[PDB]
Amino acid sequence: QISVRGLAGVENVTELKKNFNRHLHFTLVKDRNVATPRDYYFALAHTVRDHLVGRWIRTQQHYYEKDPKRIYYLSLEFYMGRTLQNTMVNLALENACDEATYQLGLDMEELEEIEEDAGLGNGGLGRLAACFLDSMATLGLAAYGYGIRYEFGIFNQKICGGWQMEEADDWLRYGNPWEKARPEFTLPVHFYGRVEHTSQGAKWVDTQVVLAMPYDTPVPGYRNNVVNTMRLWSAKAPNDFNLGYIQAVLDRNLAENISRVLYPNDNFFEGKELRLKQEYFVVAATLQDIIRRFKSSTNFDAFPDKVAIQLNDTHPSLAIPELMRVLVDLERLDWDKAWEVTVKTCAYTNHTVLPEALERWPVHLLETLLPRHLQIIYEINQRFLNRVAAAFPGDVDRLRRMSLVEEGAVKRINMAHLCIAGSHAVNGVARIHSEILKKTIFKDFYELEPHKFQNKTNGITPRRWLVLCNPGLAEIIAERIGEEYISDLDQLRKLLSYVDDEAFIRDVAKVKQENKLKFAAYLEREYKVHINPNSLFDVQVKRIHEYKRQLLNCLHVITLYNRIKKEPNKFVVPRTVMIGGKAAPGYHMAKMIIKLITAIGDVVNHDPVVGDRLRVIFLENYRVSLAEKVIPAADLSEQISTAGTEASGTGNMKFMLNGALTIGTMDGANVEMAEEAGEENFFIFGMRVEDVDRLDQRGYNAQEYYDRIPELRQIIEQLSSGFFSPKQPDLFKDIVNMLMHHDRFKVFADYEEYVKCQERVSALYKNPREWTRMVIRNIATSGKFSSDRTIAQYAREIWGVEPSRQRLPA
Amino acid sequence: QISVRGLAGVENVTELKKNFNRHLHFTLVKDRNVATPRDYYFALAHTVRDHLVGRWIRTQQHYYEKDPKRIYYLSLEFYMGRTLQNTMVNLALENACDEATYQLGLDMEELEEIEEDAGLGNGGLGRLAACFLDSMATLGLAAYGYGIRYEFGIFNQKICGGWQMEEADDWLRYGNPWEKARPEFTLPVHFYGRVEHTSQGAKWVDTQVVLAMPYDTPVPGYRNNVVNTMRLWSAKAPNDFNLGYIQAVLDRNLAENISRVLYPNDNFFEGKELRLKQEYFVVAATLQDIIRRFKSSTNFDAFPDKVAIQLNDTHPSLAIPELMRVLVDLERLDWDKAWEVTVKTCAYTNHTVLPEALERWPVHLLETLLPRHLQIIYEINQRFLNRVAAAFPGDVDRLRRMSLVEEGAVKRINMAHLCIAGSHAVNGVARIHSEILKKTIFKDFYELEPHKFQNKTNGITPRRWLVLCNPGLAEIIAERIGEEYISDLDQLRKLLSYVDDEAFIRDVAKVKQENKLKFAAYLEREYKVHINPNSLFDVQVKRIHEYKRQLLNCLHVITLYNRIKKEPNKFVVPRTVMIGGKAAPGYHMAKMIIKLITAIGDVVNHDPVVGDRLRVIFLENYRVSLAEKVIPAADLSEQISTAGTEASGTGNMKFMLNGALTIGTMDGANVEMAEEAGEENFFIFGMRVEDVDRLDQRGYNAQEYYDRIPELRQIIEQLSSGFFSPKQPDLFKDIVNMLMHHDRFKVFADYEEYVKCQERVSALYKNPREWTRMVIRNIATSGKFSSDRTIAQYAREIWGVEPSRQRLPA
Numbered sequence A, B: 001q002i003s004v005r006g007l008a009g010v011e012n013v014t015e016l017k018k019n020f021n022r023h024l025h026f027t028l029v030k031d032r033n034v035a036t037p038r039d040y041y042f043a044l045a046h047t048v049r050d051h052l053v054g055r056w057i058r059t060q061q062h063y064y065e066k067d068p069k070r071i072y073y074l075s076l077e078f079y080m081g082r083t084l085q086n087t088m089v090n091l092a093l094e095n096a097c098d099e100a101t102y103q104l105g106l107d108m109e110e111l112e113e114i115e116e117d118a119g120l121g122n123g124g125l126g127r128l129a130a131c132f133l134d135s136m137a138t139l140g141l142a143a144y145g146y147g148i149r150y151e152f153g154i155f156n157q158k159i160c161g162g163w164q165m166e167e168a169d170d171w172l173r174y175g176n177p178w179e180k181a182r183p184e185f186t187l188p189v190h191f192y193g194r195v196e197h198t199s200q201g202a203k204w205v206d207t208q209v210v211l212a213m214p215y216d217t218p219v220p221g222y223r224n225n226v227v228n229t230m231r232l233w234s235a236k237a238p239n240d241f242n243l244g245y246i247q248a249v250l251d252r253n254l255a256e257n258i259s260r261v262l263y264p265n266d267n268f269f270e271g272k273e274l275r276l277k278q279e280y281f282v283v284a285a286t287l288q289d290i291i292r293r294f295k296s297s298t299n300f301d302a303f304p305d306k307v308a309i310q311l312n313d314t315h316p317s318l319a320i321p322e323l324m325r326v327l328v329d330l331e332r333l334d335w336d337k338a339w340e341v342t343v344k345t346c347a348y349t350n351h352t353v354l355p356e357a358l359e360r361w362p363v364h365l366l367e368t369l370l371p372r373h374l375q376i377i378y379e380i381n382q383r384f385l386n387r388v389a390a391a392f393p394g395d396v397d398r399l400r401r402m403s404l405v406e407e408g409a410v411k412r413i414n415m416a417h418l419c420i421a422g423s424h425a426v427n428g429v430a431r432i433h434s435e436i437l438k439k440t441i442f443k444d445f446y447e448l449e450p451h452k453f454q455n456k457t458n459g460i461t462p463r464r465w466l467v468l469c470n471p472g473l474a475e476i477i478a479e480r481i482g483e484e485y486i487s488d489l490d491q492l493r494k495l496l497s498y499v500d501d502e503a504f505i506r507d508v509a510k511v512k513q514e515n516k517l518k519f520a521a522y523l524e525r526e527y528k529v530h531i532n533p534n535s536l537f538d539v540q541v542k543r544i545h546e547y548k549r550q551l552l553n554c555l556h557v558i559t560l561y562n563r564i565k566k567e568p569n570k571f572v573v574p575r576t577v578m579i580g581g582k583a584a585p586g587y588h589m590a591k592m593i594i595k596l597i598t599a600i601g602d603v604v605n606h607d608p609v610v611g612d613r614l615r616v617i618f619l620e621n622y623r624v625s626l627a628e629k630v631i632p633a634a635d636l637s638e639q640i641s642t643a644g645t646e647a648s649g650t651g652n653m654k655f656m657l658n659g660a661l662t663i664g665t666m667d668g669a670n671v672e673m674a675e676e677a678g679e680e681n682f683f684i685f686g687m688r689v690e691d692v693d694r695l696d697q698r699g700y701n702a703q704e705y706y707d708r709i710p711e712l713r714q715i716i717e718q719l720s721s722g723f724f725s726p727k728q729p730d731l732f733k734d735i736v737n738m739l740m741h742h743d744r745f746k747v748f749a750d751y752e753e754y755v756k757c758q759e760r761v762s763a764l765y766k767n768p769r770e771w772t773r774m775v776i777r778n779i780a781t782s783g784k785f786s787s788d789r790t791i792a793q794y795a796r797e798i799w800g801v802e803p804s805r806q807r808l809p810a
């Protein structure tokens, strides 16, 4: 039907049809009379997966013969989403499958909707890992993603009476056709026990054993026949476990609980023993696998030439002392050489500056769980602090600031300090974030070792985030500049020479309109809600956090509502304001914010005077598959974190690529997006990092803003008095109290500039032609934010490997 | 290679080879350089399973069009064993697969050894269910086996220092290629709650819900293209389960524990809540499925014409009040009509007379767990007892004897009494057993309703138990009488006219010798033990129980040893004495018996004076796959239970069919085996049922035997003094104490006759020609003990359906 979706050749279509029927019959054990849509989805999944096999086998064969340096990306999160459409896109099968299913009397789109997301992540950090895997394959790198196969991913969110309820994400219930179990590469992981000292070395003994069983999922590159591996570990009890009898068998669950569930905290640290176990489990199994592969290529001097380990935040930081443990205790290398190998092997990526998000494990936990690792950590700290003492003689305060061991009521290990010490590179995820690392939280470390510190601005894959979710945009672009931009996103710059082209302007705007109509229809069907598709689609989608300032958006919404009620017969640009995202189950303020959003909707959406001029919708169960639908339909992208708090953001880049304009603070990657597009093509408002610092010195007084802005005072009085909760008038007192007396993120200080900047958005929207020309200038300059660029920089600047765009033989 | 294993046609062999390679590539994701024996097994399993699909689909289609009466066989146990070879046998694929694998450079036998048993049963009752499914398919009956998919089957037994250790039977670890998950037919099962009475009916409310997810396994008939279904339920938590957050997800395990593990008790009742839950779980899910299928054919009068439910012991006895619950509470039928339907639908098979094996559930358990069922049971009891009162006026003691409710310290429900009341037929499993039911434990019920009581003597399938495990015997038989006996085992009678045929005598004996050499080689390879293949193979394999009198065998063994040590230079017929079987983990005496057996071996097998004249071996981990190996190699079958205690036995029939002679008491099916073969062709010894009763009246005094038999006294003095346990001289005091003072099974009373009868065995073995002629007379008369005969009798006499030998279209 459309060009970018590949060829629908006669032989390919015939071949897909017959393999589809074969799978329906032999694999699913059904015929056409009894089959449900789900059976049809599964027959298609199996038909598609068959095309990965040859390439997957030959790619891994290739790495064995060529023996390139291997990249190991260790993450506790891989937020993959759905796999069917992505696989078709990367193999150029989409149009052929569309045609094959059409002739079988099936709608492929309807079948696509049946697949559950692999929701093995919380948000941005987990999605980054997934985008990275795609780019690593597309760039021909010998890369492996290693993580945990959680039985339950991020919870499904239901909204009940305006409140978030959680339900278990039982994503494996019907079976996962995209994975291959590899029980033959099952490995032991050790826990607890004690340290014994012998004549020649320490020994870790009397351990409890848990088995790590790998499941491999293929990662196809974009049309290059490269198929890499994501290996996810599942926890299994050994067979003599606990071995009255009935209870011993039932207690196997305790061991297997390690891989049961993803911790649902976005940007918050919870010092729970189960989480620690998960962190060690992935690290111990992965390293054994790494070393096995390295030996099957004694000379551990070549280890760093053949191995790179990337730590996705501090979550797999135990990789550092585990590598040391294996090299010293088992391989019998001397400490200093083992350490040299470790540093040159490992690199650490930091994803946050929020103090509450930094992992600081209590010493008593590590003592019981991983006694040898603690000993190794103490030894690392002693030797590191000796270097600091020598570089900064007599600077006693520097010593306690830089120590891996934090003193206090409970002694803790600072995992970030561990990571910096045991890595040859440390990067932040956007230029301002990386600068904040050098200037503030890791200042001491940067002064000791400036060479270690780097920036790698985040990106998103243009395969999932343009071609897959916005085929109509991808196609109107390809008609003018060809298809090569899909794996070389800098080519979008060529679109600048079409900014005054009347045909292109019309087409860009038509595609957006079609996406909005499709999403507006989606909302009615599955959620019975009415929206005006002519309105400006104002969307804020991301995890619910105080720092992300969904509350600032709320205040804007109420301001608009109050202004309409003030002058009802005045013209306003109509808006559909959509806010979505999950709150962490324990995060009370975030749950209150959700309730506020729905409570605002209840008032606004039923006021007869408002009409179809303002709608407020809470987008339930925001997740990768939902992002793929709402992002292409958006006009306005809300990126409004307090400057200095969003390390990068990636949602921001998704919106930019799909034809939304951005209202945002100079925070995270927003700064670089504004720089690429030009500041006149971005709706920038609010305090910069320096303004925040100035206010912090002086002291943030929210009352000042309340006193001087009458529109803001009215909103606070509405919230307090029970205007938005008539039956429970004090419902939102926690929110008012926080805003007035305890606001770490200074919502009030940015309110005036935000509202003003929002008026400028509405003005531009009144002029369809100029709105669209600014949109074109955003899409045209979004090339930098491809994860192919990001990964090319990791490869050259950290891992010491060259990317390749060459095809492997088909 | 051999005739009975089917044709190896050029097209079939070519087709198997290519489908094998296709599966190795697309299914397993391997090539020939990396594949292990297990991968090769799995490629073959998938290649074979593909041939079941068309037939499986068309068989179930057929039942839908013809709407025959359906048979539902409800069991908590299905001891299936391995499936690969059985599938090949029933589809006539064995020689073709053998040839296909040979040409790929593979030994199919070696691949067969890789498959784990489906060990979903304890022993005879579980194996009976499996044999029945095979016969039901072979006889063209519309039959379904319903049970539980246990994650852990019967434990693997390891012997450590002579003691049984248990390890979890993690049989699903590598995935089960023979099942198809059917998550779409998932059904709710209710637990706990309370009973509310409304204007129109009782209602069961506030229940905890557990989901029942079915897995279907095909059951192929022998060469008739009929493929029936075994449906096994797995327990799943609902998704809002318990729904702080992390714990709620982890607590899902509590619900899913229902299908976790098989209770390892053979012939013993343990009143554990988890077991009760398992019993209701299978019953509730199965009945919903039954009723669904019945409606998709309001007129519940036709229910019994379209449905038969067979209860395999009392384990699924809750079927009776559950059917009543559904018919009264949900369908709103009046009690009396619902009851009529129930009785005509249900039939009960009893498998034991041991009082400790009868299920008697505490009232307080049913009250909490199944409050409505208890109410229904009370109502059944009241109405049943009113019938008894009317038939036997003033017989107050009869009333309390027949009550479903037993009074005492704890009130209990007698599940056997429930079953008799709610069933139109009650059968025992061998003629003497069924007679014992009418004369003793169910005497009162037989007097009230003599028409209900029947016999159905057990059988074994000749597919697994001759063709599969003894191809060499099957072939020498087929050479003379054709292949038709495989599904008409009465034809073995034709072999009587070959009892003096010199060629046949030679061939029968050659096959046994070959089987003995193969098993003797098997023992050295996998267990490093030396045996003399010229010796008489004396085997007792079955679960370890006091009633089965492994101890009587032990005493014989020691007698032989003592006699040799007495007259070392006298000739004795050499014996290899093999004893194997699992003990229930809680059963202390059974565990002591195992230790005695190994301790005897330790002494006998290392005495230089004994030589290769006597060997005592404990066969570790006895299970279906091991039975298939040892039974064909056996010369002497030990069936030596105290008369009145073994309801039937089926092991006995397996040995008879495979060319072993039987030494046994007149107990269970032994009586009918002796009757078929002629008593001169059986080694019968010991007390009959009547002799046991006589001794019981008088009082069993073990001391009498100890005093009067000097050979027996010596053995007791050896056991007591520590001859068989020099380091722990008092090790066997519990055993001696039991034999001397507390022996329910009268081991001593049968000792003299046993030893004497064993001398007569040795004498016959000295005459190879006459041994073999007696063997021929056993095999020739083993036809009665085919489960095809058994199932034909259930069909005609209980279920009201005609068996059919006709082929369905291929």
Ligand SMILES: OC[C@H]1O[C@@H](NC(=S)N/N=C/c2ccc(O)cc2)[C@H](O)[C@@H](O)[C@@H]1O
Binding pocket: A049, A050, A052, A053, A175, A176, A177, A178, A179, A180, A181, A218, B026, B027, B028, B029
């Ligand atoms: O069908 C559901 C089951 O599929 C199996 N996969 C098997 S047996 N082969 N898979 C091959 C394969 C997987 C991914 C591909 O891209 C290509 C082939 C997996 O190992 C199971 O974990 C899963 O439950």
Ligand SMILES: OC[C@H]1O[C@@H](NC(=S)N/N=C/c2ccc(O)cc2)[C@H](O)[C@@H](O)[C@@H]1O
Binding pocket: A026, A027, A028, A029, B049, B050, B052, B053, B175, B176, B177, B178, B179, B180, B181, B218
């Ligand atoms: O391969 C391992 C997996 O196989 C799946 N089976 C599938 S997807 N199809 N099975 C078809 C089938 C089964 C038995 C047959 O005899 C014929 C076909 C089962 O549903 C899973 O429970 C199992 O783990």
Ligand SMILES: OC[C@H]1O[C@@H](NC(=S)N/N=C\c2ccc(O)cc2)[C@H](O)[C@@H](O)[C@@H]1O
Binding pocket: A122, A123, A124, A125, A126, A128, A265, A266, A267, A268, A269, A270, A313, A351, A352, A357, A358, A429, A458, A646, A647, A648, A649, A650, A668
């Ligand atoms: O670089 C990718 C993205 O990473 C996110 N960080 C996230 S989602 N978690 N960051 C830290 C963290 C997460 C879970 C924890 O349990 C502890 C720390 C940042 O907040 C984003 O600004 C950034 O775009």
Ligand SMILES: OC[C@H]1O[C@@H](NC(=S)N/N=C\c2ccc(O)cc2)[C@H](O)[C@@H](O)[C@@H]1O
Binding pocket: B122, B123, B124, B125, B126, B128, B265, B266, B267, B268, B269, B270, B313, B351, B352, B357, B358, B429, B458, B646, B647, B648, B649, B650, B668
């Ligand atoms: O009919 C088949 C076979 O059934 C067996 N009975 C068995 S193995 N269990 N019988 C009762 C029982 C089992 C487990 C329980 O938890 C309770 C009762 C009998 O002991 C055999 O003599 C007979 O051949």
